[PDB]
Write an enzyme that holds these catalytic residues in place. Structure first.
Site, short mmCIF file in Angstrom:
data_model
loop_
_atom_site.label_atom_id
_atom_site.label_comp_id
_atom_site.label_asym_id
_atom_site.label_seq_id
_atom_site.Cartn_x
_atom_site.Cartn_y
_atom_site.Cartn_z
N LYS A 159 93.25 8.95 -98.52
CA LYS A 159 91.87 8.62 -98.87
C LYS A 159 91.26 7.59 -97.92
O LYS A 159 90.08 7.26 -98.07
CB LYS A 159 91.82 8.12 -100.31
CG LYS A 159 92.19 9.17 -101.32
CD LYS A 159 92.14 8.66 -102.73
CE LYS A 159 92.59 9.74 -103.70
NZ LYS A 159 92.58 9.27 -105.11
N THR A 209 90.44 8.32 -109.08
CA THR A 209 90.62 7.70 -107.74
C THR A 209 90.35 6.20 -107.80
O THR A 209 89.65 5.72 -108.69
CB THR A 209 89.70 8.36 -106.69
OG1 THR A 209 89.99 7.84 -105.39
CG2 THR A 209 88.23 8.14 -107.02
N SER A 223 87.49 5.56 -110.14
CA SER A 223 87.64 5.55 -111.59
C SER A 223 88.34 4.29 -112.08
O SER A 223 88.05 3.80 -113.18
CB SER A 223 88.41 6.78 -112.06
OG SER A 223 87.92 7.95 -111.43
N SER A 242 94.44 8.39 -111.24
CA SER A 242 95.00 7.65 -110.12
C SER A 242 96.50 7.53 -110.28
O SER A 242 97.00 7.39 -111.40
CB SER A 242 94.37 6.26 -110.03
OG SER A 242 92.96 6.34 -110.03
N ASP A 290 94.47 3.97 -115.45
CA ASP A 290 93.56 5.10 -115.30
C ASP A 290 94.37 6.38 -115.12
O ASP A 290 95.45 6.37 -114.53
CB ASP A 290 92.62 4.91 -114.12
CG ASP A 290 91.34 5.71 -114.25
OD1 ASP A 290 90.48 5.32 -115.07
OD2 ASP A 290 91.20 6.73 -113.55
N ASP A 321 94.84 4.80 -103.56
CA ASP A 321 95.91 5.56 -104.18
C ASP A 321 96.07 6.88 -103.42
O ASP A 321 95.51 7.06 -102.34
CB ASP A 321 95.62 5.78 -105.67
CG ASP A 321 94.34 6.54 -105.91
OD1 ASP A 321 93.43 6.48 -105.06
OD2 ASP A 321 94.23 7.21 -106.96
N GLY A 378 85.09 10.21 -104.97
CA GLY A 378 84.15 11.25 -105.33
C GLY A 378 84.59 12.62 -104.87
O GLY A 378 85.79 12.89 -104.80
N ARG A 421 96.68 10.11 -105.52
CA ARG A 421 96.55 11.24 -106.43
C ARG A 421 95.19 11.89 -106.27
O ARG A 421 94.18 11.24 -106.02
CB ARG A 421 96.75 10.78 -107.87
CG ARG A 421 96.52 11.87 -108.92
CD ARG A 421 96.92 11.43 -110.31
NE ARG A 421 98.36 11.23 -110.43
CZ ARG A 421 98.97 10.76 -111.50
NH1 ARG A 421 98.29 10.42 -112.59
NH2 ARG A 421 100.29 10.62 -111.49
#
Lengths: 240, 220, 202, 204, 237, 227
Positions: free
Chosen positions: B33, B1, B129, B169, B166, B17, B47, B19
């Site tokens: 999110k 994330t 992340s 994400s 990453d 994002d 999280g 995902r």
């Protein structure tokens, strides 16, 4: 009726139980307290009902902390209880904040505990007024009185009990703001001997206590050599 | 994330994002999110998703209960003090890491909140992340007192950096722009990733599947 | 973290770095580890940010209530004692190192350190954090009783600069603060203002 | 692992004005099959179903405790439930056990009982919903079913094709999972009819 | 009968709650509060009967927060309790929400506390009124009062005590003309009201004045050397 | 005197006396048009000193629910808080705004909690609860007993009988939200002992857009017998 509970008002906004609890203080022996320039002095008119009681029974001057004293008038069990509460208040204050409790604050904390008993049907109000007295280098001398209602005011001189009027009429003559403690002792004993009536009740004992510079912020019973030297002045000033 | 925020000359810009993973496998593609807290306060969440959802919902309800008694516009300090006081009480067992931002009478404020109850108010914060890739862009390209479109471009660059470097994400970039006189929730803002067009066809015709039992049950 | 406090005649001086790490990543490089508990009482914060922030908020509540209901300015010993009771009653649950510095009319400038276990002890200069190990010798060899405000600011900046140069979990910006009867001054040293020392080349 | 102690597989897939839902029919301990007619799809109203894969104890418990709440709801209320609201009810039911979690990952499929537009959702074991528009899966063969639904699913599908799609995904997925199979059952629900089929599947 | 315990009467009235409004007048004192364009003022009289009392302890003005001040009227022991509860609520507000409590909200919190005493037979109501003052961000200065029954409202001016009707007549007669409200005009209006209804020719020792202004939002209780400055100006014109 | 006691006739007397406190409060009107609901009441002060922009007899519960009352305002401020909490509980569970009937049920439950114990008096308020849910308007009337009634129009408080006959003779369907406000103000004008100003009353409406308390400007607009 309208005078059986402290949870009850009257049609004119009066709570008669709290007044009847003051009527009990009016019927008790007289205690006075005078704030000097460098301390405070308590005096109590201690009545001896029987010769079988030891000299030292029914002490009406209490040490609540190592810098605070307490004099009471009214019901005595109630006074001992309120002393026990005034002790744990000051104890927890040192436990939580780390220094001696002031007297303006202790007076408030006890006044609220006393006021809480004026609101409920399961309890009566307290039947005792009382004076607190302290001395500190920063806070100076201090004298507060607390009534059954929960009121608390500062004083330069005060009395509680039967001869309240007669005693304040003598205390206003004093220029207490000029004097020291050893000189106000004489006056305290003189007033207690003036207001005591030998015909209305039997012989009595004089009980004194101090707090000030001369004790180093330590509330003490007056020594005997000074209490006798003041009781003598009381006798010699009764030639009037 | 990957979530981010900035404070520009007039207000706040947030980004995230879309995902969501359960392991090394992609479950959702168009997640949301960025969460409603108030008409002037929004929050982004990283999280454990359920923790963030329930926490944001609870603080949202409590602020809709506070603003309705006061009759005033809420503040960001109030939301921050609610969130941190709860997360500290749970000692980190609530895995809600947040980026909270809004605009009130005092001006634009932006906070980052960690699941143990620590808080940081800063002109730009990242979380998730892809935090390091986002902040690699913010440290190089951030300036104080920026315009709306500059800030939006910066945040889009940060989230794209978190996406393309990453593994947790991807799949879109959402934004939210907040100012004293406007709010623009942009879902989606850019679509940097699109699935490939399929060449063959595998449409199964009626009959290829064998059946043992059949039942019909009319309704109205 | 590298926190520091010094007392002079009029009042106190405080100092702190600006770094907050998560392992080796620097999450916040402009942190403010100085915290006003009252108008003339400050906290220098070390350890877990959550635990210490919560303790600071709670003690601020307590001391505000206390000072309003007394109607006189509170002591530094009082705030230090509240910190002590919270850090000792919850010593198995908190990782909190604290320094309390401020001014009071009764006793003046004071410094109280409250380490992890929750003991309290007054000091002339107090250092705490993870970088204090690297300056325990400097502050002992350089401290002198009779320093004014500016000399104490200089001392506190020179120490924190070294602790930041050697400690990996300390760096960024030196946030100072001086407290006295007049008020509370606050400085921020950054870039060339941070003291530089010779780094050997041979 | 935990949820692999009993096994399971559940899928849902939308069409145009319709929706489907499918599950396997096996009950077994770790590696031993006990029963081949185990219920894992439960009706929660007409044009609304729910499916449960995980630990069978939690399957039955969640289904019963949810029917409790649903019956009280639609008694106090004077209306049948919308799918969006059943999703939140389940999310609350599961998040109440945030530290004692039920080991289930439900799958919901239904039609709104006024406008009849389809709905499909997925949740984790602590109640984070996931409202997709293509398909949702939960169980032990999740990757294998993702791989089939990504390739076979199309946007607009009449029921005759939706059934074929959701059947050819489930069969070829459970034929590569050891603890899922011994039959496959499918429900197709429309505005006017609910169709139900058991399929010819391998029993190995 | 329908007057001893908090029950309803046939005409839908609560007499034990009306009898708590009568306890406000037992102290024998009157309070006045006035609002201006940049100020808000509270005023009361300071009656010591004895010369043995310390006048410093005899007060009815109180500091709730740095920015909120109060004057209490009624039974003296009840007022200290209500004031300590106001302070606790103001402190916990800031602990929870991160900014200072308004007067609009503290007043209704005290009122919500007071209404439970009328709806539950546990505790007696408090024979005390309360007037607060404070400066708001957008609304400006505020004057708020609350009752033993849980009623609250904002005011331009109001009074509490024995001379309350004959004070609110003076005040409503002066408010209609809508002069250019100022600090000095406000304090003069309050003192003139308290002088007219009592007819006493005040000294600086017989009153205590607390003020709050948009320039300095901190509540401050005035000195005798600063009340004299406003008292002398009255005799002139 | 006591509340956990029946009379031989089978009546609860303290509830009947709590309704007498509702029957002596300020009037309040309620009308349910086809595309909205109106709530109007008398907000009159005992002096020019009372600031009328500080307290409200018309209050919102949500974006789409609102209230008025007749009787005791202290009692009103408790039920306002309780209703605002119950709506948020419903939203927290179902993530849907609460319907107007479920709130009335759950609030009458609160009013009934205060009718069964000794040491508690009932509420001295009745409520009027307006809403807009499922493309239809609603109007209810909760009482201290724990009983609610759905109305098309009604009036509570002083002169609640003539104010209701006026509605029986001067109200029909095929109205809209603007023809109903005129009728509500006309129904309040019966009992208005003086000139009706923009500040002596308080109005709130609900519709597809949600609940809103009108402003003194909008009140002064229709106070001219306009619309």
């Amino acid at each position: 009726g309208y005078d059986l509970s402290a949870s009850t008002f009257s049609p004119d906004g009066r709570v008669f139980q709290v007044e009847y609890a003051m009527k009990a203080v009016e019927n008790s022996s007289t205690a006075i307290g005078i704030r000097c320039k460098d301390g405070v002095v308590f005096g109590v008119e201690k009545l001896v009902l029987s010769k079988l009681y030891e000299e030292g029974s029914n002490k009406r001057l209490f040490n609540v902390d190592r810098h605070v004293g307490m004099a009471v008038a009214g019901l005595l069990a109630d006074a001992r209880s309120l002393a026990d509460i005034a002790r744990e208040e000051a104890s927890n204050f040192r436990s939580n904040f780390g220094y001696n409790i002031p007297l303006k604050h202790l007076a408030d904390r006890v006044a609220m505990y006393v006021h809480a008993y004026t609101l409920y049907s399961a309890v009566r109000p307290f039947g005792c007024s009382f004076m607190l007295g302290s001395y500190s280098v920063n806070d100076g001398a201090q004298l507060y009185m607390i009534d059954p209602s929960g009121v608390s005011y500062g004083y330069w001189g005060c009395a509680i009990g039967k001869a309240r009027q007669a005693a304040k009429t003598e205390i206003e003559k004093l220029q207490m703001k000029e004097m020291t403690c050893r000189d106000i002792v004489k006056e305290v004993a003189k007033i207690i001997y003036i207001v005591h009536d030998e015909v209305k009740d039997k012989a009595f004992e004089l009980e004194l206590s101090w707090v000030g510079e001369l004790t180093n912020g330590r509330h003490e019973i007056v020594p005997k050599d000074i209490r006798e030297e003041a009781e003598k002045y009381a006798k010699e000033s009764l030639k009037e | 994330t990957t979530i981010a925020g900035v404070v520009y000359k007039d207000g706040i810009v947030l980004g995230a994002d879309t995902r969501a993973t359960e392991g090394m496998v992609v479950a959702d593609k168009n997640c949301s999110k960025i969460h409603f807290i108030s008409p002037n306060i929004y929050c982004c969440g990283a999280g454990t998703a359920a923790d963030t959802d329930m926490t944001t919902q609870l603080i949202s309800s409590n602020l809709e209960l506070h603003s309705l008694s006061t009759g005033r516009l809420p503040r960001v300090v109030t939301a921050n003090r609610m969130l941190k006081q709860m997360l500290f009480r749970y000692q980190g067992y609530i895995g809600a890491a947040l980026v909270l931002g809004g605009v009130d009478v005092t001006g634009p404020h932006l906070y980052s909140i960690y699941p143990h109850g620590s808080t940081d108010k800063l002109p730009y914060v990242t979380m998730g992340s892809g935090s390091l890739a986002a902040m690699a862009v913010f440290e190089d390209k951030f300036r104080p007192d920026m315009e709306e479109e500059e800030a939006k471009n910066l945040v889009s660059e940060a989230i794209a950096a978190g996406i393309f470097n990453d593994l947790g994400s991807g799949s879109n970039i959402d934004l939210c722009v907040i100012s004293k006189n406007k709010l623009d929730f942009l879902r989606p803002y850019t679509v940097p990733n699109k699935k490939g067009t399929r060449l063959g066809r595998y449409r199964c015709e009626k009959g290829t599947t064998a059946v043992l039992t059949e039942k019909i049950t009319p309704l109205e | 973290t590298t926190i520091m406090a010094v007392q002079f005649d009029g009042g106190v001086v405080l100092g702190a770095d600006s770094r907050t790490t998560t392992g080796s990543y620097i999450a916040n490089r402009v942190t403010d580890k100085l915290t006003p508990i009252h108008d003339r009482i400050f906290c220098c914060r070390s350890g877990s940010a959550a635990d210490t922030q919560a303790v600071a908020d709670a003690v601020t509540y307590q001391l505000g209530f206390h000072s309003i209901e007394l109607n006189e300015p509170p002591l530094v010993h009082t705030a230090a004692s509240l910190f002590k009771e919270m850090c000792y009653r919850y010593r198995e649950d908190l990782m909190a190192g604290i320094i309390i510095a401020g001014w009071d009319p009764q006793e003046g400038g004071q410094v109280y350190s409250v380490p992890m276990g929750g003991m309290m002890v007054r000091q002339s200069f107090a250092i705490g954090g993870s970088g204090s190990s690297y300056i325990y010798g400097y502050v002992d060899a350089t401290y002198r009783e009779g320093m004014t405000k500016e000399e104490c600011l200089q001392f506190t900046a020179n120490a924190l600069a070294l602790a930041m140069e050697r400690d990996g979990s300390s760096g960024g910006v030196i946030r100072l603060a001086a407290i006295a009867e007049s008020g509370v001054e606050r400085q921020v040293l950054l870039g060339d203002q941070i003291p530089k020392f010779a780094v050997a080349t041979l | 692992s935990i949820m692999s102690y009993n096994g399971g597989a559940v899928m849902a897939m939308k069409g145009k004005n319709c929706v489907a839902i499918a599950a396997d029919r096996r009950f077994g301990i770790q590696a031993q099959m006990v029963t081949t007619d185990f219920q894992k799809i439960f009706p929660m109203g007409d044009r609304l179903y729910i499916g449960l894969a995980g630990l069978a104890t939690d399957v039955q418990t969640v289904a019963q405790r949810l029917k409790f709440r649903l019956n009280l709801y639609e008694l106090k209320e004077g209306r049948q439930i919308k799918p969006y609201t059943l999703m939140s009810m389940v999310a609350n039911l599961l998040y109440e056990k945030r530290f004692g979690p039920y080991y289930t990952e439900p799958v919901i499929a239904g039609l709104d009982p006024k406008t009849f537009k389809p709905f499909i959702c997925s949740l984790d074991l602590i109640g984070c919903p996931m409202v997709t528009d293509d398909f949702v899966v939960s169980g032990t063969c999740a990757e294998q079913m993702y791989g089939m639904c990504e390739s076979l699913w199309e946007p607009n599908m009449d029921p005759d094709h939706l059934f074929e799609t959701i059947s050819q995904a489930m069969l070829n997925a459970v034929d590569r999972d050891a603890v899922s199979g011994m039959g496959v059952i499918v429900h197709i629900i429309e505005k006017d009819k609910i169709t139900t089929r058991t399929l010819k599947a391998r029993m190995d | 009968f329908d007057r001893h315990i908090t029950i309803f009467s046939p005409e839908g009235r609560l007499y034990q709650v009306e009898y708590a409004f009568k306890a406000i007048n037992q102290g024998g004192l009157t309070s006045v509060a006035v609002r201006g364009k940049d100020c808000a003022v509270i005023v009361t009289q300071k009656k010591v009967p004895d010369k043995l009392l310390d006048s410093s302890t005899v007060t009815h003005l109180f500091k709730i927060t740095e920015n909120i001040g109060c004057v209490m009227t009624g039974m003296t022991a009840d007022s200290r309790s209500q004031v300590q509860r106001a302070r606790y609520e103001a402190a916990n507000w800031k602990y929870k929400y991160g900014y200072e409590i308004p007067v609009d909200m503290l007043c209704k919190r005290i009122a919500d506390i007071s209404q439970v005493y009328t709806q539950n037979a546990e505790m007696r109501p408090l024979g005390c009124c309360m007037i607060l003052i404070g400066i708001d961000e957008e609304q400006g200065p505020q004057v708020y009062k609350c009752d033993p029954a849980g009623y609250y409202c904002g005011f331009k001016a109001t009074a509490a005590g024995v001379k309350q009707t004959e004070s609110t007549s003076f005040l409503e007669k002066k408010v209609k003309k809508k002069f250019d409200w100022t600090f000095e005009q406000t304090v003069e209006t309050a003192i003139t009201c308290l002088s007219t209804v009592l007819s006493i020719d005040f000294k600086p020792s017989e009153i205590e004045v607390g003020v709050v202004t948009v320039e300095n939002p901190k509540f401050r209780i005035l000195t005798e050397a600063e009340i004299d400055a406003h008292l002398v100006a009255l005799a002139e014109r | 005197f006591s509340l956990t006691t029946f009379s031989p006739s089978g009546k609860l007397v303290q509830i009947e006396y709590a309704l007498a406190a509702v029957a002596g409060g300020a009037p309040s009107v309620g009308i349910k048009a086809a595309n909205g609901v109106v709530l109007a009441t008398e907000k009159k002060q005992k002096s020019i000193l009372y600031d009328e922009r500080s307290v409200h007899k018309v209050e919102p519960i949500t974006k789409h629910i609102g209230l008025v009352y007749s009787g005791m305002g202290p009692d009103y401020r408790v039920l306002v808080h309780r209703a605002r909490k119950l709506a948020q509980q419903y939203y927290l569970v179902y993530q849907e705004p609460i319907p107007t009937a479920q709130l009335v049920q759950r609030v009458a439950s609160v009013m009934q909690e205060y009718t069964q114990s000794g040491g508690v008096r009932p509420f001295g308020v009745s409520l009027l609860i307006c809403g807009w849910n499922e493309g239809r308007p609603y109007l209810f009337q909760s009482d201290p007993s724990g009983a609610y009634f759905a109305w098309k129009a009604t009036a509570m408080g002083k002169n609640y009988v003539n104010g209701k006959t006026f509605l029986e003779k001067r109200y029909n369907e095929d109205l809209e939200l603007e023809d109903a406000i005129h009728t509500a103000i006309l129904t309040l004008k019966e009992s208005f002992e003086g000139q009706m100003t923009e500040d002596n009353i308080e109005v709130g409406i609900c519709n597809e857009a949600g609940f809103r308390r009108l402003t003194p400007t909008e009140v002064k607009d229709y106070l001219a017998a306009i619309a």
